[PDB]
Ligand binder design. Structure first.
Ligand SMILES: NC(=O)c1ccc[n+]([C@@H]2O[C@H](COP(=O)([O-])OP(=O)(O)OC[C@H]3O[C@@H](n4cnc5c(N)ncnc54)[C@H](OP(=O)(O)O)[C@@H]3O)[C@@H](O)[C@H]2O)c1
Ligand SMILES: NC(=O)c1ccc[n+]([C@@H]2O[C@H](COP(=O)([O-])OP(=O)(O)OC[C@H]3O[C@@H](n4cnc5c(N)ncnc54)[C@H](OP(=O)(O)O)[C@@H]3O)[C@@H](O)[C@H]2O)c1
Lengths: 324, 333
């Protein structure tokens, strides 16, 4: 068996600063632990996902590696479904090499950048598809509002909506991102939420006849502003509330007969092949695009993870652990 | 044409905060009971009036007009009709005036079954019954064995929701605002458990005590702090049919709801509805429920105030829980 040096990002203590994490260098024997069905992988890309905050205080353990979604190459497998040389995405450790237990998706199309399987072709892409295509029941010509529209999930939701023939507006936190939403992603309109004194008035300006669908990533005052601007039988897919303050306008659910429904992407993984079958031709035809931020090396991962909760990422924040 | 005095309940003023009796007054006018020339109007004699909580919304500046009669659902007898669909002597329910006699422009529903109390067509056989039916059967997607919580559970809508859920084999708990209403929930309506929300130190602890495995379905009539207590107690894929939020109707600023994050962790569907959208189901409802009423399988409690002069008191009393069951005003006999 190969025995190799293995750099790891370790949680130093419960929580978010760089100094709450630590780089540790250990040795690993690259062998499937005896009698298990484990998979030994070399990690290529690691995703920085907002939900990781919840686990830093199902939680992570101080002294142990951070874990998250990544893209990896299989080195050894005790599981029939995976063999040496396979590329996979799934939960893995923040380290060069991980032993992953049976409790993980094989990658088949290598014609797109591999980092995409942390975003558009990974969990965030599946989240956008589940939330918009399944939860929202969208129809051509409907009006759609996306909060956190320039993030990994939101940038896809808006494009999926444009593909269906919807009118799409997005909210973002800077000029650079607002311009991106319109220039790159093809949103009909977008606005900087930080500049608006009255979010309700802002949405009225962009939606003179109201919002059919709100893809909710934010919550709070933004939700209150959406509620008063919804159309009859409007739908709200509750994906995240990254801002998280009391919500005051829920009476609008009755007068407008709104369905507001939360979901978790892992309930929808049985639809992943269907999602891929839709989105991969669209990527290859340049009809759906994706923007990510890629940091080089594990020694960059502490910086990359912290920077996520102030919107220092543009699209999905990724860490490249290794080239291949 | 018959010429008669017509007492009316007038809205005096738009209302802020809680309504009081003095926000309304009784006026007497003379009118003639005649259909205006070439119109398709119906002249009726009002028999029963519903007091419904949504009327509070209409007291703000759709809304009522100060100086004019209050309007709402009632049961009436047709006296003259410019509409071929309605004949003298017909009994109807639908929107009418808070007065002895009204002129209507025909949905007015024609009542065919009078082997049930006519006052039932303000409640169980009228708009509240239909709300309970559509809200629970359609919006909640209920299944046998599920756990169900109903707020304002002894009221016109809630007392029916709990019975409908029991009939389906659900475990059903209700909250209400007095010992008398709690006893009624358990002894008359067949709720499995019920509690007085005013005597609970912590509503989320109270609900945890009644729903140790969580709540599959919340039929929401109250909003406010109750909704926040429910959210933290919902089961996975739980559903909330948002019917009303009466705890908010008299506030000049609503209370903030803080626990919506639970919609994500628990994958909850929270959906508002208006009974107005479900009237195509009213025949099905009436055909199901009337035989159940006549067979004593579904039961009802209404509170009948007597005379138009009692109507302001009956309406205002909804907001302090003075009604026991569906609040009705008997106009005539
Ligand atoms: N339900 C599920 O299964 C599921 C799955 C994956 C993700 N999620 C959730 O979906 C949401 C978006 O995920 P993502 O991966 O697309 O995140 P992302 O790439 O970070 O986009 C999130 C963005 O939200 C904006 N934001 C941050 N703080 C804000 C605030 N206080 N007020 C308004 N906007 C703020 C930022 O962009 P600006 O520059 O525009 O401020 C931030 O970059 C997150 O809440 C995440 O937890 C849910
Ligand atoms: N969506 C629709 O189409 C539709 C149609 C009809 C009715 N509704 C709504 O459904 C709800 C129930 O209507 P209903 O006709 O059955 O009324 P109801 O329950 O017969 O009477 C109203 C009851 O509200 C409770 N209440 C009043 N103030 C409260 C407060 N601050 N906190 C908690 N409870 C309070 C009281 O009972 P306690 O003594 O138990 O406090 C009072 O008896 C109302 O919100 C109504 O607006 C909706």
């Amino acid at each position: 068996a190969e025995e190799v040096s293995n750099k790891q990002v370790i949680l130093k203590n419960y929580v978010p600063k760089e100094s709450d994490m630590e780089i540790k260098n250990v040795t690993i024997k690259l062998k499937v632990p005896e009698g298990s069905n484990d998979v030994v992988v070399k990690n290529l890309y690691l995703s920085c996902d907002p939900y990781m905050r919840s686990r830093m205080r199902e939680s992570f353990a101080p002294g142990s590696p951070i874990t998250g979604y990544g893209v990896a190459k299989v080195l050894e497998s005790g599981d029939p479904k995976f063999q040496k040389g396979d590329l996979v995405w799934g939960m893995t450790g923040w380290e060069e090499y991980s032993i992953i237990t049976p409790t993980l998706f094989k990658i088949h199309d290598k014609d797109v950048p591999l980092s995409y399987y942390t975003g558009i072709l990974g969990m965030p892409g599946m989240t956008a598809y589940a939330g918009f295509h399944e939860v929202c029941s969208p129809k051509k010509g409907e009006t759609v509002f996306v909060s956190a529209a320039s993030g990994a999930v939101g940038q896809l939701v808006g494009q999926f909506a444009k593909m269906l023939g919807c009118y799409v507006v997005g909210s973002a936190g800077s000029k650079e991102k607002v311009d991106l939403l319109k220039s790159k992603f093809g949103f009909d309109e977008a606005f900087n939420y930080k500049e608006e004194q009255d979010l309700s008035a802002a949405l009225k300006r962009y939606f003179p006849d109201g919002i059919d669908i709100y893809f909710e990533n934010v919550g709070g005052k933004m939700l209150d502003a959406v509620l008063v601007n919804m159309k009859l039988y409007g739908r709200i897919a509750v994906c995240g509330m990254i801002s998280q303050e009391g919500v005051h306008n829920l009476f609008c659910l009755i007068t407008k007969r709104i369905r507001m429904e939360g979901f978790l992407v892992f309930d929808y993984y049985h639809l992943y092949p269907k999602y891929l079958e839709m989105v991969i031709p669209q990527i290859k035809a340049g009809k759906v695009v994706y923007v990510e931020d890629v940091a080089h090396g594990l020694e960059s991962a502490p910086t990359a993870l912290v920077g996520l909760f102030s919107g220092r990422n543009i699209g999905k924040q990724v860490v490249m652990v290794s080239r291949e």
